[PDB]
Structures are given as C-alpha cells and as structure tokens.
Structure 1
Amino acid sequence: GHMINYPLASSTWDDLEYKAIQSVLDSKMFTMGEYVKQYETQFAKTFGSKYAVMVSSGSTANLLMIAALFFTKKPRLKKGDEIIVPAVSWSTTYYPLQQYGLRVKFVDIDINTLNIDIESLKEAVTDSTKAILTVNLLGNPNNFDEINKIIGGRDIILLEDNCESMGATFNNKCAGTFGLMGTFSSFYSHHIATMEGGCIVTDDEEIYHILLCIRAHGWTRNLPKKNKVTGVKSDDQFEESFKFVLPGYNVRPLEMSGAIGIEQLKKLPRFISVRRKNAEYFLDKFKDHPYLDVQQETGESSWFGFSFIIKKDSGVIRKQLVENLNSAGIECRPIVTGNFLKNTDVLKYFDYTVHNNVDNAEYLDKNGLFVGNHQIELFDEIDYLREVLK
C-alpha cells in the first residue's frame, strides 16, 4: 500500500493567505519588515507573552533560545552547564545544546503522556542542574505545576520547545509561556503554516533585546535607542548602523511569512476547535481498544496528531500495523523520532549522560506510531481508521 487518502498533512490556507502574499508582492518589499513586526505583536498578544520574535524556523528559534542565555549581562548559562531534556523529541531540540557546549542529561518519558517522566525528573534534578528544557509533545502540554514543584523556587531555568503544541493550554495559560522562553514552529502542516517559520516568546526585555540582535548579524539596527544590549545607541548612523555587539546569525524570516502568519493567527481559534472536536471523537472511538493505547491528555491539548502505543504483551507487531495502515491508504509515521538515544553517530558529538534508563522511550521506539490530525473534520477518516485497526 502506497496510495494515501488519509494523509498526515494538509493545507491551512485559503484565499486570504494568497491575497496576503499579493500584498507583499505589490509592496515590492521582501525583506523582514512591517508585516513581520505586526505579526510579532499579534503573536505575543495571542499567546499572552510580552515579547515575540519571528525567525526562519522552529529549529532556528531553538538555536537562538539557547544562544541567548550566553549573552546576558550576567550570562545565565556557561559551557559545560547541565541541562535536562526528554529522550523523545525533534533533532533540532538537542543540536543547539551540543553546539553551545552544554552537558546534556537525558530523562525518560512518561508512557501515557509521552512527555517527560515526572517521577524520574524528580530524581534527575540536582544541585548541578542549570536548566530544564521541556517539550510539549504532539499538542500535549507538560504538567507545569508539578514541574514547578520540583524546582521549588530555585534558580533553574525552565525552557519550552513548543513547536508541536501551539494553542495547547494548561491551567488556562498558553503552552510556551511557562518558560523563560518558549519556541514555536510555523512550518508546513503545523497548527499554522507560513511555508517555513518560527517564533520565540519571552517576558524578559533583555533576552528580548538580545534576540533581536542575534537574529540579524549581531548588529544594533533592530534595537531601540535605549536597549538592554548597548544601553544607548549613538546618533551617528555611519557608525551606529555598522556596529556589531554579539556573535549572532542571519535567521531573519521573510516578509511573506510574516504577512501569512497574520492571516493564520486569525484562524487559530477555529483550527484548535476543529482539532479538538476530532480528538474527542477519536478518544471515544479508541477508548477501550484491545491492543492500542492513546495519548493521555494534560490540560487542554492542541492535538497535533494521534499516537498509538501497542499494548504490552498484545503480541501485536508494529510492522504489520504499519503495513496494514498503508495498504488501507492511511499515512503513518513513528512517534516523532522515536527514542533519540538510538542515534549513536550523532551522540558521539555530545557531552551527555542518561538518568537511570530510557525504558519507556525504547518501548515507544519499537511499539509506537502516529497518524495525522487536521483542522478539518475527520469523523469519517476516524471511523475508517478504527475499522482498519480492529
């Protein structure tokens, strides 16, 4: 089976977005400008954060997020610092840690939530832990309350990779706003899509400043006269426009993406709505499934897609399932990357350690799968899927 009728991805666009590109074309201004800024403003508003910075991708968002910590007047991070992460996530969640010389401490996930295992996190955290980098998997937010209990008020930075859970909420607060900084992705087929695109949110003005700076050449052009980076900008452009203060990058997003994001954000409430209705329907259909477990929701998940974990001693073979789905026209993939720890070749480059074991991650790596969720009603696709997975 190779004929796909129930795909993982689909378009979130309509006329409005095409018109938006048009507006850009007419403007003949393609470099990051007005729209990006407007986009950022609404973005922060939408999620309930003070600041938001748009970047080229969710991956680059992650990059700047980590980097930023090295540049505070009083650097918040230092080479060799210990950072805790879950064993399951996207590759670019981990790379920047390596690229910045951090010591990475891996923590197993919770088999029901798919998020970091709270119990293990409990023990994993020590006096050496400088930061915790959480990942809201597949739309499901982490239990921040519990996380917070662990920190117990210490000076441990909390960070969030919210690339898969835009719109998710916990305790009424938007996922991605819990940490010092939160990242998002607007890549094709995410809660929203801007072709390629990412964002970083924060309530910290210094960090905010740093970001603006590191996003583009390490210059002061995007900074305000009075800023937390250089204090006060010289009034001499010949000089001013040509000074570099931080070792940054060029990860500016395109104006087009910004203009598109604007249209997309307006639709967000509806997208979340549909996705959630679909999930409700799904949970109901798969409630007592004989050999598959579904993701256990925390707070209000933005249900990026649907995960399945073959029940222990169910004798079910992932391979057949997959075959079966495909033959039926259902597209499927591993749960993200599966157990990240399997990537031995890339790990060679990391300075890392594993807390305890990553048993659950290993199980998932072998018995997990996932099908798409859309901002479109999938009742019928769901009935069929249930039919197939008998």
Structure 2
Amino acid sequence: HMINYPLASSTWDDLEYKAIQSVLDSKMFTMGEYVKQYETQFAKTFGSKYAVMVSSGSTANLLMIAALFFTKKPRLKKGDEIIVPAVSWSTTYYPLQQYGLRVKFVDIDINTLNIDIESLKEAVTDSTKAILTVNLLGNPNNFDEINKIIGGRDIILLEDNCESMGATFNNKCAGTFGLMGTFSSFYSHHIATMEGGCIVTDDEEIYHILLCIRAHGWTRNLPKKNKVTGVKSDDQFEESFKFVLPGYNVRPLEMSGAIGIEQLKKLPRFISVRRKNAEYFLDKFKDHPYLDVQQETGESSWFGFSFIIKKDSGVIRKQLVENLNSAGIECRPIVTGNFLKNTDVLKYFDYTVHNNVDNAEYLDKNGLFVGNHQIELFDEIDYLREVLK
C-alpha cells in the first residue's frame, strides 16, 4: 500500500546539514568537542546535573543497569528484584537479563498505557530492589503516586524515557525523576541524531562510572579527581593505559553530537507542534464510538497516537488495520504489545508475573498506533477521523 500519512518524518533542516559539514571540515570524527557540548546543553535543557551521550537509547539502557553494579557500595546484585511494566521496547528488558536480575512484571493501566498503579502497590515488597518505569508514547508516569508507594524506602527508581523526551509532570522533566533516566535520538524520535541515546543523572559517582564504562573501562575521560579511581596518576604512559571497570565501547559519533546541538535548540518548537496536534486529535476523537485514546498524565510529549478498540465493540483489529493501510495511513502495534508473549526470549530470563497481565493482553490484540509529528497534521487528523468512522 501507498503511504501518505507515515509514522515517521525528518526533523532536520539546513542547520543540521551545516553541522555535519563543520564536523567534516574539522576532520575529527571521534567522540569529542561537540559531544561534550551536547551533553552540557542536554543536562541544562532537562534540568539534570549530568548527561552522558551513548550510541543508542538501547545502549543507554545497558549502561544504566550496569552502572549500578559498580558503585563503591554496589546498588545492585545478581538475583535482585526489579519491577517493570509488561509493555515496552525489548531493550528495556534485555539488560536486566544480561545482568542476572530477577524480573517482576506488572500489568499496565489500560487508559494511561503506563504501569498500573494499583497493581504496583501490591507488587512492591521487601524484596523489591528497584523499579524500572517507562514513560510510554510521550506520557509520563504519575511519579507522585509512585513515590507514595516507595514511601522513602531504599528502592531505586529508574526511567526509560526513550519515547517521552520533553514530557513533564509537576513541572519537572520526565527522565529526571529517577536515579537515572534514558533517552533516545534515533530516527524519528522527538529529536534525531541518526542513532543516539543519553543517560541523565544527578549523582556524581554514577556519572563518573558512566564515563568509564562507555569507553573501554579506561580512565581517559575521567577528571584527575574522580569517584572511580580517586586521583589519576600523572604518568600517561601508565595512566592512559589503565582499565578499571568491565565496560564497553558504546561511544557516539562526533557527528551525532553536532546534530544534537541543532536539534535541542528546536525542541521547544517540536514539543509545541506535537502538543497542538494532540489537542486537535483529542478533540476529534473525544467521543469515538469504538476507539479509546490515551489518557494524559501531566504534559505528554505525544510521541504518537494510540487507539484501543472498545470492549464489546465487536470491532476487529485486522479490519481496521487493513482499512487504515488501504487509505494510505501507516500504522503499527502499540510498541511491542504484550511483551510476555515472547516465550522464546523469556526462556532466558529469571522472571515472574505479578498477578496477571490482562490489560497488556487486551492491548496486544486490540491496540494500534498512528504517527504524531513535529509538523501540523490537522488535515491528516481530519482524514483519519473520516476513515475511522
């Protein structure tokens, strides 16, 4: 089928192409100046003390988890219990498996698409070591409630903010609530640097650990006085060749950093347009006869538009999809649907399901999603509405 209303689009203009050119002219392609400047603007934009740019949102999630094992007083141990929602991207879960964590799956709230608060209440026990929240499709989690659950205990809160860059809750930026928050700059995300991801944090030790684990486990990117090795020697013959933590090579490219700088400047505008489209969309689908929309928490950055076929509406997903496609509208499942359906990969995990994941299953069979862009889509929205009659 020929597609006229696509999920994705370009966020770039001449500015980004000019930024690539500068990099080319510099003849310095390895992670450097631009990446650093990008990191600095990144932390500033979102209201976090530190930011570390990585190769992808997936590698951001990887470093996020790994980091916890390397604190002077390790924050995590093999076998520790971590709670996650049943709907998210695959790379939200893999690192948990890769680090030998015990995973506890919690159902989602069918209206918000986020972790079900009532379920979470019950799922958290004395054994819960961390909670890994995911801000789905631009919609932030209700952190106030989440915080009420933790009730001051020593439970780490983490956020995969790969789909909700720019969302806010209580006037605070999503991604900044947790000990760490991850973002993604892959093609067609709120911003795009070809490939790219970021980790934000306010913790200095964690920040130093990240700088180390991102590139070979060395000390080259650490300050003379750092929280990992304390004080770096002055003998570079020695110093430059020391390895202290079991890391990776997940450095981003300088180009991505330079592009990111341009993208960040435009973010306020992107969020604005996306939010205006959302408004229009909600108005148009307000009392839809057989489709429910996502219920907003705080100020969502509306990554895209989800629809859930109403219970006993007798509407069949398959037809809708055909219908949309035939109409030139691109569509997809809501992320990966119920992650628990992936039995082959789950064989590798040490996990458990809290209660049931009835909502996740429902969504899995009755949900779908269409794109939202940083471009006015009023016409596309009128048409979509027309098609979904």
Instruction: Report the alpha carbon displacement of residue 242 of structure 1 after superposing the two structures with TM.
Output: 0.1
Instruction: Report the alpha carbon displacement of residue 164 of structure 1 after superposing the two structures with TM.
Output: 0.0
1:151 equivalenced with 2:150 (yes/no) = yes
TM-score under structure 2 normalisation?
A: 1.00
Instruction: Report the alpha carbon displacement of residue 206 of structure 1 after superposing the two structures with TM.
Output: 0.1
| Partner deviation per Cα, 1:137-157 (whole Å, 9 max, x = no partner) | 000000000000000000000
- State the secondary structure of the residue aligned to 2:103: strand
Instruction: Report the alpha carbon displacement of residue 296 of structure 1 after superposing the two structures with TM.
Output: 0.1
| Partner deviation per Cα, 1:362-383 (whole Å, 9 max, x = no partner) | 0000000000000000000000
Which aligned segments of 4 or more residues in structure 1 are displaced greater than 4 angstroms? Answer: none
Instruction: Report the alpha carbon displacement of residue 3 of structure 1 after superposing the two structures with TM.
Output: 0.5
Report the equivalent of 1:329.
328
Instruction: Report the alpha carbon displacement of residue 115 of structure 1 after superposing the two structures with TM.
Output: 0.0
Instruction: Report the alpha carbon displacement of residue 302 of structure 1 after superposing the two structures with TM.
Output: 0.1
CA distance in 2, matches of 1:355, 1:203: 31
Report the equivalent of 1:385.
384
CA distance in 2, matches of 1:278, 1:130: 39
Instruction: Report the alpha carbon displacement of residue 5 of structure 1 after superposing the two structures with TM.
Output: 0.1
Instruction: Report the alpha carbon displacement of residue 107 of structure 1 after superposing the two structures with TM.
Output: 0.1
1:15 equivalenced with 2:22 (yes/no) = no
Instruction: Report the alpha carbon displacement of residue 349 of structure 1 after superposing the two structures with TM.
Output: 0.1
Instruction: Report the alpha carbon displacement of residue 250 of structure 1 after superposing the two structures with TM.
Output: 0.1
Report the equivalent of 1:270.
269
CA distance in 2, matches of 1:10, 1:45: 26
Instruction: Report the alpha carbon displacement of residue 96 of structure 1 after superposing the two structures with TM.
Output: 0.1
1:358 equivalenced with 2:371 (yes/no) = no
CA distance in 1, matches of 2:353, 2:64: 23
Report the equivalent of 1:187.
186
Instruction: Report the alpha carbon displacement of residue 20 of structure 1 after superposing the two structures with TM.
Output: 0.1
| Partner deviation per Cα, 1:205-236 (whole Å, 9 max, x = no partner) | 00000000000000000000000000000000
CA distance in 1, matches of 2:149, 2:242: 43
> For 1:1-390, what aligned pairs fall within 5 Å after superposition?
2-390=1-389
- State the secondary structure of the residue aligned to 1:200: strand
Instruction: Report the alpha carbon displacement of residue 86 of structure 1 after superposing the two structures with TM.
Output: 0.1
Q: RMSD in angstroms over aligned alpha carbons?
A: 0.1
CA distance in 1, matches of 2:47, 2:363: 34
CA distance in 1, matches of 2:153, 2:36: 35
Instruction: Report the alpha carbon displacement of residue 132 of structure 1 after superposing the two structures with TM.
Output: 0.1
Instruction: Report the alpha carbon displacement of residue 27 of structure 1 after superposing the two structures with TM.
Output: 0.1
- State the secondary structure of the residue aligned to 1:283: helix
Instruction: Report the alpha carbon displacement of residue 14 of structure 1 after superposing the two structures with TM.
Output: 0.1
- State the secondary structure of the residue aligned to 2:276: helix
CA distance in 2, matches of 1:225, 1:118: 44
TM-score under structure 1 normalisation?
A: 1.00
- State the secondary structure of the residue aligned to 1:104: strand
Instruction: Report the alpha carbon displacement of residue 78 of structure 1 after superposing the two structures with TM.
Output: 0.1
- State the secondary structure of the residue aligned to 1:349: coil
| Partner deviation per Cα, 1:283-337 (whole Å, 9 max, x = no partner) | 0000000000000000000000000000000000000000000000000000000
CA distance in 2, matches of 1:371, 1:303: 11
| Partner deviation per Cα, 1:252-288 (whole Å, 9 max, x = no partner) | 0000000000000000000000000000000000000
Instruction: Report the alpha carbon displacement of residue 58 of structure 1 after superposing the two structures with TM.
Output: 0.1
- State the secondary structure of the residue aligned to 1:326: helix
Instruction: Report the alpha carbon displacement of residue 10 of structure 1 after superposing the two structures with TM.
Output: 0.2
- State the secondary structure of the residue aligned to 1:106: strand
Instruction: Report the alpha carbon displacement of residue 245 of structure 1 after superposing the two structures with TM.
Output: 0.1
CA distance in 1, matches of 2:235, 2:299: 51
CA distance in 2, matches of 1:311, 1:38: 47
CA distance in 2, matches of 1:258, 1:353: 39
CA distance in 1, matches of 2:96, 2:305: 29
Alignment length, in residue pairs?
A: 389
Instruction: Report the alpha carbon displacement of residue 112 of structure 1 after superposing the two structures with TM.
Output: 0.1
Instruction: Report the alpha carbon displacement of residue 19 of structure 1 after superposing the two structures with TM.
Output: 0.2
- State the secondary structure of the residue aligned to 1:83: strand
Instruction: Report the alpha carbon displacement of residue 48 of structure 1 after superposing the two structures with TM.
Output: 0.0
CA distance in 2, matches of 1:29, 1:171: 41
Q: Using the aligned pairs only, state the percent identity.
A: 100
Segments of structure 2 that go 5 or more residues without pairing to the other structure are: none
- State the secondary structure of the residue aligned to 2:130: strand
- State the secondary structure of the residue aligned to 1:335: coil
Instruction: Report the alpha carbon displacement of residue 168 of structure 1 after superposing the two structures with TM.
Output: 0.1
